[PDB]
């Protein structure tokens with residue numbers, strides 16, 4: 001092959017990912033997985049500092065070559081579990097991810113499957129969106145983590161909006177703050193009911209049309225809503241305000257990435273350097 005393998009980075013949703021070096025000396029992430037070939041190639045001209053760079057597409061099996069980053073946010077949260085990620089670093093990462101999402105969404109690209117282990121970090125303080133769930137959206141063929149899935153997806157919405165990524169990022173924000181997953185369900189209905197028990201069972205008042213969702217059942221239990229002071233306790237009122245807007249049930253009420261960037265929570269945002277053990 002044109003690539004000397006270094007290690008298997010892991011198993012994505014679409015296939016294996018390897019750390020490999022180009023035999024240019026470049027160290028890359030090599031993901032293994034037409035007419036979609038045209039769409040995927042468009043993404044390569046679209047670049048943003050908070051999106052992992054797609055270097056090459058090769059159909060011969062489908063291969064995607066990405067820039068390599070040494071650690072993901074899931075590993076960093078685990079490493080930081082005794083102390084917690086410092087709030088200025090949580091704030092910088094959230095701000096950067098919202099910048100990345102605002103870029104994607106302005107180009108009508110959804111991520112669809114945001115989770116800590118798809119968020120890649122470097123020693124310089126950057127964080128970048130990786131492992132986009134774009135196969136289905138492009139028509140590409142061939143245990144799932146549901147913890148970050150928006151409620152309209154779980155209720156069988158046929159068309160996703162950009163709001164699904166804001167929901168996921170809100171769940172990630174909460175987990176960075178509390179050091180524990182916000183909604184750790186193990187089935188679609190367990191995920192849904194974990195959301196309902198915390199945020200209240202949605203009705204037509206807070207979510208017009210929810211009772212017409214394909215998978216909505218009138219026999220859903222009716223749980224009342226808790227208080228965000230209980231949900232992410234340490235977080236100040238600016239962060240709790242922003243989080244509540246990223247977790248609105250109604251996708252139309254849920255804050256956009258660009259509006260979130262103007263939220264007062266980010267008035268004092270900085271770019272700290274993380275302590276990384278590689």
Ligand SMILES: O=C(O)c1cc(C(F)(F)F)ccc1NCCc1[nH]nc2ccccc12
Nearest residue numbers: 043044046054104109130131132134135138
């Ligand atoms: O991330 C992956 O694994 C991945 C998988 C596939 C598929 F083949 F599975 F469909 C396609 C693209 C993939 N990433 C594209 C990253 C990217 N570059 N520029 C972008 C601008 C805006 C939004 C995203 C952008």
